[PDB]
Every structure is written in structure tokens, then in C-alpha cells.
Amino acid sequence: SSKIDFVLSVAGGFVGLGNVWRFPYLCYKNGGGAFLIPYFIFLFGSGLPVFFLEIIIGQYTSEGGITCWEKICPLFSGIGYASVVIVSLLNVYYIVILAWATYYLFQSFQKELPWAHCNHSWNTPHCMEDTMRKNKSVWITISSTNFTSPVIEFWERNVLSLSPGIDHPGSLKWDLALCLLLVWLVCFFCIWKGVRSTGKVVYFTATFPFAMLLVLLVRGLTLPGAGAGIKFYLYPDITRLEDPQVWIDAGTQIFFSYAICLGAMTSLGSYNKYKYNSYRDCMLLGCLNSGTSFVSGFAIFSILGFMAQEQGVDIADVAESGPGLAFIAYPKAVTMMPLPTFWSILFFIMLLLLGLDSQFVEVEGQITSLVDLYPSFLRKGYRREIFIAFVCSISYLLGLTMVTEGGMYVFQLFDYYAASGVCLLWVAFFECFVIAWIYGGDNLYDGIEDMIGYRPGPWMKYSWAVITPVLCVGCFIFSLVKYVPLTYNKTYVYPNWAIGLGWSLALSSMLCVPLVIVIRLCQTEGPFLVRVKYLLTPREPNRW
Ligand SMILES: [Cl-]
Structure with missing residues (x-):
């Protein structure tokens, strides 16, 4: 009987689209090896206390995502609304990946793959x-006139149908629309019916993705030219560390992968009992997720190095330097494997399930929060399923601007600004500030000692007070001083209106905390200082 494996299985899945798709593309965009020096360090902080913090806030207060902060500090109660806005923006574009994967699945039911030949x-x-491309006849006699x-x-001209710019929307793709509609219908059915068939299928849904990742890694390591990719993934460049965008991506990757600032972990902590040693399980899940990301990066960069040595170009110019790196890398290695159809179908089913699990969790958490906001209004009678269908339809309609010809730019904007970037850093900095300098570190340490049984070391308090807030403030100041506009595949410059829309989508979630502060100050009666003292005091009992 393996205790660690059993507890990590029962606790919850830790694999998704934030490690095989987000991490490899963010690493390839930020120079490869140079992305690992800050990230890993940041990882530790951004992994160990903060995630665990959301596990304890939900365990101590025994509440969801929105009502947990109403006990620690009623003044800074806008963190729940900010997380709700962030997950509402995330459910729009995160499920679009499940549409590209579904379209790739339906195109992999034939003997000959379409992306294999020209x-x-x-x-x-x-x-x-x-x-x-490297054959002596074509490489020498025939000039390399932008041969791709x-x-x-x-991928580009059949899945995305890319346009010259975001200003050109083009025509709506019926295939992607039908795939996204089917995925949304599956999600709605799984939510309204309830997913309770995980009594024994969890073993399969946990072993199959890891088995496919292991097979892909073994195939990538046995391919010629993988050494150059491994060196590019491991050997860092000190020049890229000066760029503020690398630090921003490294900080937001962990907040995206560990579901931090999404309020889902605060809800999962409420499911955990009071006298429960959540520290060990949190550390184990974090280390396992980091190892999975590190292993997937090896396979991605080995495939990239193989493609580079086959084509004959630099490693940083092999594929798209943006969202869609896995779809270029993994199908190539699948085609290189015998019986490409079977392995392609397996990998696509794995990716679809890994995306659907996180999508189910996020949408169920969002719906639960929105229902708890107005229980009698959104729970009595049949209005619950009506509200669920309304949210699903609104998200599908908002996800129709990413499946058009000029929809990849909107997807990049939502990936960079809406559910990641400045918003997650802002939310994490505010959470750490409220925990350390407002609620106190010693009281929370005593609470954790009473709950799990032993008081942790000084790492959590110092990271909540010093490491994470100072790091977030420094990253924000560095992004403000040396600000570079967002670019797509290092060749497209986004117009001013697109950057403005992205910043507005970011501020929509960023301003949830200051606006709630003003609302609470205006609602409370009394002098300004008395109102501040009343709203900073832990009024609601924290379940001592
Ligand atoms: Cl990651």
C-alpha cells in the first residue's frame, strides 16, 4: 500500500494544459534555457507558500472563494470577485484549445495524416x-525562398486560417464553431448530470497521460539532433534575463499551472478537514507538477531540435513562437512513430481529457461562486440549470472571436492579458500583503500548527511578507519602465487598439480590489479611520 500515491490520487488531478502547452510555449518564447533561471526560483515561492496559502485559507475559514476573504479581512474582500472575473475570462479561451484538439482528433481518423505531406x-x-529540406538536390540547387x-x-492555413492582422476578422470557421459547440455541450451535460463516474476511471485518467508523456519523451530522446534541443532548453542566456517580459511569463506560468488566483484551491481547501496535514500533500503536488512540466519541456525541445537538424535552421526559428507549439511539435514525433494514426488519436484524447478536467473544475467553481452570491435568486426551482446554460452560451459567444480568421490574435491577447500576466501578479501580491501585513504571520502559523499538527518553518512567513510581494512589485515596475508591445510569432505588431483592449481586459479584473474597498468604505458608517479599523479587523470568526 503506497500512501503517497493514494493520497495524491485522492487529493486531485494535477495535470492539464498549463504544463504541456503553456510551459513549453512560454519557454520557447523566452529564449529557452534563460527562462528556467528565474522561473524555477520564482516557482519555489510561487509554488510553495501561495498555493498552500489558498489551501489553508479555505481550510481555516471553511468557506469558498468569495466568502473566505470576508473572514480574514472584510476590507480586501474584492479578491474573490477578481478571481471570479479571472476565471470567467479564462473559461472563454482555455476551452478554445479543446476545440483545436477536437478538430485535430477528427482529422486523425485516416491512415495518412494531412500535416505529414505537402x-x-x-x-x-x-x-x-x-x-x-536538407537533401543535397534541394538544399543546394534550389534557393530557400521562405519554404515552410x-x-x-x-496548422496555420487549415486550423487557424490566419489573417494579416487582428483588424481583419475574415469569415467564421464553421468547423471550429461546431467543435467548440460540441465541447460546450459535453461540458454542460457533464456539469448538469454531475461527474460521479470517477470511482475507478481516475486510475486510467491518471496513468494514460503520464504513459503518453513517457512514450513521447522516449521517442524524442531517441531522435537525432535532440542534443541541441536539450542544450538550448538547459543552457541559459544571461541577456534574456534583462528583459522584463521573461520574468513576467515565468511568474505567471506557475499561477496559471497551479490554479493560483483562480479561487478553485480556496474551495478545495474547504473540502479538506480541519485536522489534516495538507502541507505534505501540497508540497508533493507542487513538486510532481513541476517535474511533469520539466519532463514535457525536454520532449518539446528535443522534437524542436530534431526538426531544426532536419530542416537546417536555428533552434529559435523552427516553429511558431507563440500559442500552438505543441500542435507543431508532438504530431511530428507521432508521424515519426510507427502507426501514426493510433498514437495521434491517443495523444489527442489525452489532451482533450486533460483540458476537459480543468475546464469542468473551473466552470463548476465559477458557477458555485455565482450561485452562492445570490442563493435564493439563482438556486430556487429550475433556474440553476438555466443559469448554467446561460453562462455556457455567453462563454461560447465570447469564444467565437477566437475561432475566426483573425481570431488567433484575440486568443494571444486573452492568454497574455486576460487570465495571466499583470492580473495574477496583482492578485497574488494583494493576497500575500493581506495575509502577512494585515492578518499577521504568527497567528496564521499558530493556526497551521493547530490544524496540521506542527508549526512550519520560517519559509512561508518570509515568502508571504518579503519574497513574493517584493518580487511582484519589482516585476511590475520593470514591466512599466521597459515596456514592449505584445508581438505574435516575433513578426506581427499589435495595433494600439488591441493593446488598449488587452489592458482594459486586465484592468477589469485588477480593479475588483480597489472598487470593493471604496464600496465597503462608503457602506460602513462612521469616521474614516473607524471604518478602516472596522474593515481591517477579523470580524467574522475564522473557525478557531
Ligand atoms: Cl508549469
């Missing part, structure tokens, strides 16, 4: 086979 309608005349890889051209 003999197709969507391919341009500049399409060339990867094996012919077949997989990249297939």
Missing part, C-alpha cells in the same frame, strides 16, 4: 517536405 489544397507552393514546414503550414 500534397494538399491548403498548402502553398512554398511547401516542402522536411526530409527534402508542412505541419506549420497545415
Whole structure:
């Protein structure tokens, strides 16, 4: 009987789209090895206390995401609303990945994969086979007039139908629309019916993704040219560390992967009992998720190095330097494996399930929070399923601007600004500030000692008071001083209106805390200092 494996299985899944898709693309965008020096360090902080913090706030107060902060500090109660806005913006574009994966799945039910060869309608005349790119006849006699890889051209001109800019929306893609509608219908059915068939299927849903990742890693390591990719992934560049965008991406990757600032962990902590040693389980889950991300990065960069040594170009210019790196990398190694159809279907089902689990968790948490906001209004009678369907339809309609011709730019904007970036750093800094300098570190340490049984070391308090807030403030100041506009595939410059829309989407969640502060100050009766003292005092009992 393995205690650690059993407790990590019963606790909850820790694999999703934030480690095989977010981490590899963020690492490839930020120079590769140079992305690992800050991230890992940041990881520790951004992994160990903060996540555990959300586990304790939900365990101590025994509340959800919105009502937990109403006991620690009624003044800074806008963190719950900020997390709700963040998850509402995340459910829009995070499920779009499940539409691209679904479309790839329906295109992998044939013997010959379409992205393998250039003999197709969507391919341009500049399409060339990867094996012919280094052939002496084509590489020497024929000039390299912007000849692109077949997989990249297939992806762009058949899945995204990329436009010259975001100003050009184009025509709506019926295939992506139908795939997204089917995924949303599956999500609505699983939510309204309730997912209770996980009594024994958890073993499969946990072993199959890890088995596929292991197979892909073994295949990538046994491919020629993987050494260059491994070196590019491991050997850092000190020049990239000066860029503030690298630190921002490194900080937001962990907050995205560990579901931090989403309020889901605060709800999961309420499910845990009071006298429960959550510290060990949190550390184990964090270390396992970090190891899974580190292993997936090895496979991604080995595939990238193989593609580089086959085509004959630099490692930083092999594929798209943005969202969609896995779809270029992994299908190539799948085609390189015998029987590409079976392995492709397996990988697509794995990715679809990993995305659907996180989507179910996030949407159920959001719906539960919105229902707890107005219980008698959104719970009595049949209005609960009506509200669920309304939220699903609104999210699907808001996700129709990312499946168009000019929809990839909106997807990049939502990935960079809406559910990640400045918003998550702001929320984490405010949470750490309220925990350390407002609520106190010693009282929380005594509470954790009473709950789990032993008082932790000085790492958590120092990270809540010093490490995480100062790091977040420094990253924000560095992004403000040396500000570079967002770029797509390092070749497209976003217009001023797109940057303004992204900053507005970010501020929509960022301003949830200051506005709630003003609302609470105006609602409370009395002098300003008396109101501040009343709203900073832990009025509601924290379940001592
Ligand atoms: Cl990660």
C-alpha cells in the first residue's frame, strides 16, 4: 500500500494544459534555457507558500472563494470577485484549445495524416517536405525562398486560417464553431448530470497521460539532433534575463499551472478537514507538477531540435513562437512513430481529457461562486440549470472571436492579458500583503500548527511578507519602465487598439480590489479611520 500515491490520487488531478502547452510555449518564447533561471526560483515561492496559502485559507475559514476573504479581512474582500472575473475570462479561451484538439482528433481518423505531406489544397507552393529540406538536390540547387514546414503550414492555413492582422476578422470557421459547440455541450451535460463516474476511471485518467508523456519523451530522446534541443532548453542566456517580459511569463506560468488566483484551491481547501496535514500533500503536488512540466519541456525541445537538424535552421526559428507549439511539435514525433494514426488519436484524447478536467473544475467553481452570491435568486426551482446554460452560451459567444480568421490574435491577447500576466501578479501580491501585513504571520502559523499538527518553518512567513510581494512589485515596475508591445510569432505588431483592449481586459479584473474597498468604505458608517479599523479587523470568526 503506497500512501503517497493514494493520497495524491485522492487529493486531485494535477495535470492539464498549463504544463504541456503553456510551459513549453512560454519557454520557447523566452529564449529557452534563460527562462528556467528565474522561473524555477520564482516557482519555489510561487509554488510553495501561495498555493498552500489558498489551501489553508479555505481550510481555516471553511468557506469558498468569495466568502473566505470576508473572514480574514472584510476590507480586501474584492479578491474573490477578481478571481471570479479571472476565471470567467479564462473559461472563454482555455476551452478554445479543446476545440483545436477536437478538430485535430477528427482529422486523425485516416491512415495518412494531412500535416505529414505537402500534397494538399491548403498548402502553398512554398511547401516542402522536411526530409527534402536538407537533401543535397534541394538544399543546394534550389534557393530557400521562405519554404515552410508542412505541419506549420497545415496548422496555420487549415486550423487557424490566419489573417494579416487582428483588424481583419475574415469569415467564421464553421468547423471550429461546431467543435467548440460540441465541447460546450459535453461540458454542460457533464456539469448538469454531475461527474460521479470517477470511482475507478481516475486510475486510467491518471496513468494514460503520464504513459503518453513517457512514450513521447522516449521517442524524442531517441531522435537525432535532440542534443541541441536539450542544450538550448538547459543552457541559459544571461541577456534574456534583462528583459522584463521573461520574468513576467515565468511568474505567471506557475499561477496559471497551479490554479493560483483562480479561487478553485480556496474551495478545495474547504473540502479538506480541519485536522489534516495538507502541507505534505501540497508540497508533493507542487513538486510532481513541476517535474511533469520539466519532463514535457525536454520532449518539446528535443522534437524542436530534431526538426531544426532536419530542416537546417536555428533552434529559435523552427516553429511558431507563440500559442500552438505543441500542435507543431508532438504530431511530428507521432508521424515519426510507427502507426501514426493510433498514437495521434491517443495523444489527442489525452489532451482533450486533460483540458476537459480543468475546464469542468473551473466552470463548476465559477458557477458555485455565482450561485452562492445570490442563493435564493439563482438556486430556487429550475433556474440553476438555466443559469448554467446561460453562462455556457455567453462563454461560447465570447469564444467565437477566437475561432475566426483573425481570431488567433484575440486568443494571444486573452492568454497574455486576460487570465495571466499583470492580473495574477496583482492578485497574488494583494493576497500575500493581506495575509502577512494585515492578518499577521504568527497567528496564521499558530493556526497551521493547530490544524496540521506542527508549526512550519520560517519559509512561508518570509515568502508571504518579503519574497513574493517584493518580487511582484519589482516585476511590475520593470514591466512599466521597459515596456514592449505584445508581438505574435516575433513578426506581427499589435495595433494600439488591441493593446488598449488587452489592458482594459486586465484592468477589469485588477480593479475588483480597489472598487470593493471604496464600496465597503462608503457602506460602513462612521469616521474614516473607524471604518478602516472596522474593515481591517477579523470580524467574522475564522473557525478557531
Ligand atoms: Cl508549469
